[PDB]
Enzyme design. Sequence first.
Site, PDB file in Angstrom:
ATOM      1  N   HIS A 131      -7.902  10.438  26.882  1.00  0.00           N
ATOM      2  CA  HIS A 131      -6.931  11.023  25.932  1.00  0.00           C
ATOM      3  C   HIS A 131      -6.837  10.154  24.697  1.00  0.00           C
ATOM      4  O   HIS A 131      -7.448   9.072  24.655  1.00  0.00           O
ATOM      5  CB  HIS A 131      -5.555  11.135  26.556  1.00  0.00           C
ATOM      6  CG  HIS A 131      -5.514  11.959  27.804  1.00  0.00           C
ATOM      7  ND1 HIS A 131      -5.489  13.323  27.774  1.00  0.00           N
ATOM      8  CD2 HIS A 131      -5.592  11.615  29.114  1.00  0.00           C
ATOM      9  CE1 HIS A 131      -5.441  13.790  29.005  1.00  0.00           C
ATOM     10  NE2 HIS A 131      -5.535  12.773  29.844  1.00  0.00           N
ATOM     11  N   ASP A 171      -3.391  12.199  17.730  1.00  0.00           N
ATOM     12  CA  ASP A 171      -3.585  12.545  16.327  1.00  0.00           C
ATOM     13  C   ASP A 171      -2.182  12.853  15.817  1.00  0.00           C
ATOM     14  O   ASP A 171      -1.540  13.852  16.212  1.00  0.00           O
ATOM     15  CB  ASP A 171      -4.519  13.765  16.219  1.00  0.00           C
ATOM     16  CG  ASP A 171      -4.560  14.436  14.858  1.00  0.00           C
ATOM     17  OD1 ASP A 171      -3.802  14.095  13.897  1.00  0.00           O
ATOM     18  OD2 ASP A 171      -5.430  15.369  14.772  1.00  0.00           O
ATOM     19  N   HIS A 200      -0.163  14.085  12.841  1.00  0.00           N
ATOM     20  CA  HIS A 200      -0.231  14.706  11.521  1.00  0.00           C
ATOM     21  C   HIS A 200       0.558  13.926  10.456  1.00  0.00           C
ATOM     22  O   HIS A 200       0.369  14.164   9.297  1.00  0.00           O
ATOM     23  CB  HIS A 200       0.232  16.179  11.519  1.00  0.00           C
ATOM     24  CG  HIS A 200      -0.659  17.114  12.304  1.00  0.00           C
ATOM     25  ND1 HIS A 200      -0.419  18.472  12.358  1.00  0.00           N
ATOM     26  CD2 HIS A 200      -1.769  16.888  13.037  1.00  0.00           C
ATOM     27  CE1 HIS A 200      -1.364  19.040  13.099  1.00  0.00           C
ATOM     28  NE2 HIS A 200      -2.153  18.097  13.575  1.00  0.00           N
ATOM     29  N   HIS A 228      -0.707  15.454  18.497  1.00  0.00           N
ATOM     30  CA  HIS A 228      -1.300  16.031  19.677  1.00  0.00           C
ATOM     31  C   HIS A 228      -2.515  15.249  20.084  1.00  0.00           C
ATOM     32  O   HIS A 228      -3.045  14.511  19.311  1.00  0.00           O
ATOM     33  CB  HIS A 228      -1.665  17.525  19.403  1.00  0.00           C
ATOM     34  CG  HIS A 228      -2.661  17.721  18.321  1.00  0.00           C
ATOM     35  ND1 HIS A 228      -4.008  17.529  18.491  1.00  0.00           N
ATOM     36  CD2 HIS A 228      -2.495  18.088  17.026  1.00  0.00           C
ATOM     37  CE1 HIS A 228      -4.637  17.795  17.368  1.00  0.00           C
ATOM     38  NE2 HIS A 228      -3.742  18.112  16.444  1.00  0.00           N
ATOM     39  N   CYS A 229      -2.985  15.488  21.307  1.00  0.00           N
ATOM     40  CA  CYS A 229      -4.193  14.868  21.826  1.00  0.00           C
ATOM     41  C   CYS A 229      -5.409  15.585  21.210  1.00  0.00           C
ATOM     42  O   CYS A 229      -5.330  16.772  20.838  1.00  0.00           O
ATOM     43  CB  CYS A 229      -4.118  14.896  23.352  1.00  0.00           C
ATOM     44  SG  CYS A 229      -5.482  14.020  24.090  1.00  0.00           S
ATOM     45  N   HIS A 288      -7.025  20.370  25.635  1.00  0.00           N
ATOM     46  CA  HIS A 288      -5.923  19.404  25.823  1.00  0.00           C
ATOM     47  C   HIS A 288      -4.606  19.860  25.172  1.00  0.00           C
ATOM     48  O   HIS A 288      -3.502  19.740  25.725  1.00  0.00           O
ATOM     49  CB  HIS A 288      -6.379  18.017  25.260  1.00  0.00           C
ATOM     50  CG  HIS A 288      -7.248  17.276  26.209  1.00  0.00           C
ATOM     51  ND1 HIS A 288      -6.912  16.046  26.733  1.00  0.00           N
ATOM     52  CD2 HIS A 288      -8.374  17.665  26.838  1.00  0.00           C
ATOM     53  CE1 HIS A 288      -7.829  15.684  27.609  1.00  0.00           C
ATOM     54  NE2 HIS A 288      -8.745  16.633  27.665  1.00  0.00           N
ATOM     55  N   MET A 315      -0.423  18.935  25.502  1.00  0.00           N
ATOM     56  CA  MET A 315      -0.410  17.623  24.886  1.00  0.00           C
ATOM     57  C   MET A 315      -0.059  17.696  23.381  1.00  0.00           C
ATOM     58  O   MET A 315      -0.892  17.458  22.510  1.00  0.00           O
ATOM     59  CB  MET A 315      -1.723  16.885  25.122  1.00  0.00           C
ATOM     60  CG  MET A 315      -2.022  16.707  26.580  1.00  0.00           C
ATOM     61  SD  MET A 315      -3.095  15.309  26.895  1.00  0.00           S
ATOM     62  CE  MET A 315      -2.135  13.888  26.461  1.00  0.00           C
ATOM     63  N   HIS A 350      13.673  32.927  15.327  1.00  0.00           N
ATOM     64  CA  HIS A 350      14.837  33.752  14.963  1.00  0.00           C
ATOM     65  C   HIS A 350      15.998  33.393  15.892  1.00  0.00           C
ATOM     66  O   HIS A 350      15.814  33.158  17.085  1.00  0.00           O
ATOM     67  CB  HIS A 350      14.498  35.207  15.106  1.00  0.00           C
ATOM     68  CG  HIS A 350      15.667  36.123  14.955  1.00  0.00           C
ATOM     69  ND1 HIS A 350      16.108  36.546  13.724  1.00  0.00           N
ATOM     70  CD2 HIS A 350      16.373  36.824  15.875  1.00  0.00           C
ATOM     71  CE1 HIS A 350      17.101  37.404  13.888  1.00  0.00           C
ATOM     72  NE2 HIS A 350      17.257  37.620  15.183  1.00  0.00           N
ATOM     73  N   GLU A 352      16.524  35.233   8.232  1.00  0.00           N
ATOM     74  CA  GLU A 352      16.670  35.920   9.490  1.00  0.00           C
ATOM     75  C   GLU A 352      15.601  35.380  10.455  1.00  0.00           C
ATOM     76  O   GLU A 352      15.894  34.999  11.586  1.00  0.00           O
ATOM     77  CB  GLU A 352      16.604  37.449   9.277  1.00  0.00           C
ATOM     78  CG  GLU A 352      15.247  38.047   8.877  1.00  0.00           C
ATOM     79  CD  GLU A 352      15.359  39.475   8.433  1.00  0.00           C
ATOM     80  OE1 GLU A 352      15.836  40.319   9.238  1.00  0.00           O
ATOM     81  OE2 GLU A 352      14.917  39.769   7.312  1.00  0.00           O
ATOM     82  N   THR A 353      14.370  35.281   9.950  1.00  0.00           N
ATOM     83  CA  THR A 353      13.199  34.841  10.736  1.00  0.00           C
ATOM     84  C   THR A 353      12.341  33.914   9.845  1.00  0.00           C
ATOM     85  O   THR A 353      12.182  34.195   8.656  1.00  0.00           O
ATOM     86  CB  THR A 353      12.401  36.054  11.195  1.00  0.00           C
ATOM     87  OG1 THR A 353      13.256  36.883  12.002  1.00  0.00           O
ATOM     88  CG2 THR A 353      11.204  35.654  12.031  1.00  0.00           C
ATOM     89  N   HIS A 403      10.081  36.066  17.221  1.00  0.00           N
ATOM     90  CA  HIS A 403      10.402  37.490  16.935  1.00  0.00           C
ATOM     91  C   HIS A 403       9.208  38.415  16.850  1.00  0.00           C
ATOM     92  O   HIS A 403       9.295  39.520  16.339  1.00  0.00           O
ATOM     93  CB  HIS A 403      11.329  37.723  15.685  1.00  0.00           C
ATOM     94  CG  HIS A 403      12.269  38.913  15.802  1.00  0.00           C
ATOM     95  ND1 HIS A 403      11.863  40.228  15.839  1.00  0.00           N
ATOM     96  CD2 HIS A 403      13.626  38.953  15.937  1.00  0.00           C
ATOM     97  CE1 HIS A 403      12.917  41.032  15.955  1.00  0.00           C
ATOM     98  NE2 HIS A 403      14.003  40.277  15.990  1.00  0.00           N
TER      99      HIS A 403
HETATM  100 CU   LIG Z   1      -5.632  14.607  26.112  1.00  0.00          CU
HETATM  101 CU   LIG Z   2      -3.877  18.649  14.514  1.00  0.00          CU
HETATM  102 CU   LIG Z   3      15.988  40.934  15.901  1.00  0.00          CU
END
Ligand SMILES: [Cu+2]
Ligand SMILES: [Cu+2]
Ligand SMILES: [Cu+2]
Lengths: 335, 335, 335
Positions: free
Chosen positions: C88, C91, C93, C128-129, C138, C143, C248, C272-273, C299
């Site tokens: 493993h 990363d 971001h 994430h991995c 993964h 992960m 939502h 709303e969303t 939603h």
């Molecule tokens: Cu992994």
């Molecule tokens: Cu990424």
């Molecule tokens: Cu709705």
Amino acid sequence: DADKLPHTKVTLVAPPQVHPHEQATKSGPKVVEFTMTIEEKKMVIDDKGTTLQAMTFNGSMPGPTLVVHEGDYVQLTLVNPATNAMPHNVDFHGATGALGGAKLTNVNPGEQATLRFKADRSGTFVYHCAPEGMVPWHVVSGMSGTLMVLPRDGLKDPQGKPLHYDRAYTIGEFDLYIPKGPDGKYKDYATLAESYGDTVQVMRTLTPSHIVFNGKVGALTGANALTAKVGETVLLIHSQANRDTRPHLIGGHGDWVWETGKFANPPQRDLETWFIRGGSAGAALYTFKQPGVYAYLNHNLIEAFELGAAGHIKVEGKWNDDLMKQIKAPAPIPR
Amino acid sequence: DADKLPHTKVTLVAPPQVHPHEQATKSGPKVVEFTMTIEEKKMVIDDKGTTLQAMTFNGSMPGPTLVVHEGDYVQLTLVNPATNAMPHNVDFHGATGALGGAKLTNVNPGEQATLRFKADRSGTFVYHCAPEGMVPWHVVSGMSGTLMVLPRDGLKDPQGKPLHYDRAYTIGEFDLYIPKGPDGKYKDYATLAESYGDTVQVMRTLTPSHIVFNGKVGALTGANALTAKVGETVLLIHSQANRDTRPHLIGGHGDWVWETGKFANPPQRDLETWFIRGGSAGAALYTFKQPGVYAYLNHNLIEAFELGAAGHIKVEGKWNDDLMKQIKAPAPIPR
Amino acid sequence: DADKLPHTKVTLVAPPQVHPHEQATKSGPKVVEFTMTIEEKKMVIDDKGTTLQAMTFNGSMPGPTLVVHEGDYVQLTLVNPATNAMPHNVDFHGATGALGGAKLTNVNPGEQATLRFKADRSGTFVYHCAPEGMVPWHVVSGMSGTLMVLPRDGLKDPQGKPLHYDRAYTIGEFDLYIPKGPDGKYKDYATLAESYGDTVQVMRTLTPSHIVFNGKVGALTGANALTAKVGETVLLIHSQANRDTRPHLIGGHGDWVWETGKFANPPQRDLETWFIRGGSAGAALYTFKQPGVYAYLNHNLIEAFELGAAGHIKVEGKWNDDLMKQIKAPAPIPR
Ligand SMILES: [Cu+2]
Ligand SMILES: [Cu+2]
Ligand SMILES: [Cu+2]
Ligand SMILES: [Cu+2]
Ligand SMILES: [Cu+2]
Ligand SMILES: [Cu+2]
Ligand SMILES: [Zn+2]
Ligand SMILES: [Zn+2]
Ligand SMILES: [Zn+2]
């Protein structure tokens, strides 16, 4: 009135490069003249030899990027050689009227036409083929690209401060719909017209077989990786004429991003992942700060790693321990 | 306190029209009264006779658009006639509390109820049915529409300058999930309750059979095209209660777009394609500059042309050679 | 130079909680130290007993949220115990260089490593991995998690006015791809490595079997609902490392939303969303105004109700008849 403007002629270049151009300009408006020639051809789109019965502007997926400035006129000669089977046309999202110009550019094999329109809005805009009754098929088969209309004073940040790029790359992302026969292997078609029915059936599933940058799995990797160096600002133009995508630079960021692609709107900063709506082009700036091989990909990681939507950028320069440092290398967990 | 406000009664109109209303208003707040009657019915949704066992507010997909101003109260009487089979309710995204009002509007056939809520936020907001344990089925079967809450001083651009529209059209986009029998043909169900199980199986695939504007393939085409004239500003309200979509005007633009649909946020300008998140309504302004037949569609071009998510706008007026001109008509490629 | 900064040690907590932290701070930069231990395990992900051969940071889906401030350094010790089968890495971001740190954190079972990077950009960022040749597997197996980098002066509205939250909850949404055998039932795998091939086949369909919050259908419901009270502002952190989602709050709103998750950009109000792009984390504020049980969900209502992407928030306090009132309870339609 455009009849009395200076004319200029631009020579287009193959993606992922973008033809020479200025950002901010002291120039007034011009009629900028371009020519593109349609080519239908069969293309190998993956490492296992799968073919696509493809359709292109200028022999590439995507078509070349056209660059003008806000207030210019685009004047395109669209050529459909007699060696092609199908009629074609062009719909410029950057244009106003006549279904983007499609109604005025219907060319059968052996024909050509010339369209002019005013590039009155700044941004990156898709263009694509749009023949009546065949629109999705032509688009997914490869017939799209980007028109970039730069503000006359160049790019601006949300406070109106100047932005620039030192090099520009154009990435087209193509969702492909390759049919399979009863043995589960991809079909190989001897002509373009014979791929149509089977392809339409796959399209209606909404599940692409492949999703590729610039026409093929691995197009922007190895000897064809994009390149930069620490301290250089890159503009990444990302078009998807048919289907949403979510660009991400692994190890980097979108420093300034116009994800809807329209430069009169302020950009967002610091993005990890941005969104390009199907039927649009967007634009990101990033200034490199670390050397190494970055991945630029669609961050649906299945679409990227399994289906093909991923490329590389190889960056030259000096490592920066302030931004990142390996404090302890991998080693056995202590006794 | 709303008990002491003026009351007003609004008569709703069928989509794609929107009932008469003011934009900027000198009026203070009111209780605005509306009534809607639920109708279950079987509907033909394509050109080949396929049926949907549908569920509607007021007999249409989408339901009618309700228009008030920020600070008003919406007071809706929801009627579920005894001719219907199922219970229903309403969840207004524009409202605060009680699952949007759903908890206070549970009506069995032969019942009605009246809900009041304060429309304290400006924007276009989905409303939809949301019965416990059946929510997705009611929504995808047709039970959604838009509440538009206008700012009391009307729409504003990013600098706070006034914006307006001269006519408004409401477009609801419905992802449908019609089952098929062992012969590959769509099933026809004699009652609503008998469509349920088979439909749920298709829903869970996440692949719609059809994606339609306003209840049917071709609903907004031919004699039912939307209309405008050069120099008129149109407001296009686009709701999708269940699934993302990407509206685009071919030959036009989104001049000013609130793609999240909330008018206290600045709009973006010059969009080629915008994004409506499933579970939302968004709003675009465009002022026509060229006459002709435009296409307004979902720019996943498979969803548009193959599955149904496309309509037309027929625009009257004078052609403008400055914005676009055919320099050379299609003709043989030179010797 | 980070070698001469104060160091601090943070104890992480299990989602949906977020570890104690300050918003605006008088503190200068520090090296903030964290440790995470990878755990592979089989998990029950639905009510009918379906299992996932899962992979986690710290035993949970998502991993814990890490909180620092802009200008701090994150210093993570990543531990891969010998009881695990797979290598493993991580990363981030939020980081710059070396594929987010993945290149410097490759740990085989029985190994560990320590990475430092400068958290120089404000926002919520996925981590994430990303092991070479196995990245999507993964990630979809569990992960991922969020790094939240707060501005040193806390959150700001579009006019630069202060915003805050009183409690924070972290929601990870996982699209899962569980294979089925010839009898149509989900497969149960005795080891992680034996689930791989069959899973990859489901992934390439792009159709998840399940889409869950925090590792399981119903994870954030019943005794595990999120809680608040009228007048409290909640921050909802929503990560999706692989696939788009559309959060939502039913009966509520996004008062202030950073849907791309980057706090140096102004938020949108009244949503709303909102939309979380696959490969990102976003953040919404909402101040409760009504008591009751709210639903927080994706939603796409199929993804929510059929596939699992939905949770509850139980809110204490006094009902407000101004915001919403039942004018007439459900009753027979008049004679
Ligand atoms: Cu992994
Ligand atoms: Cu990424
Ligand atoms: Cu709705
Ligand atoms: Cu074509
Ligand atoms: Cu188009
Ligand atoms: Cu209903
Ligand atoms: Zn043949
Ligand atoms: Zn029957
Ligand atoms: Zn075994």
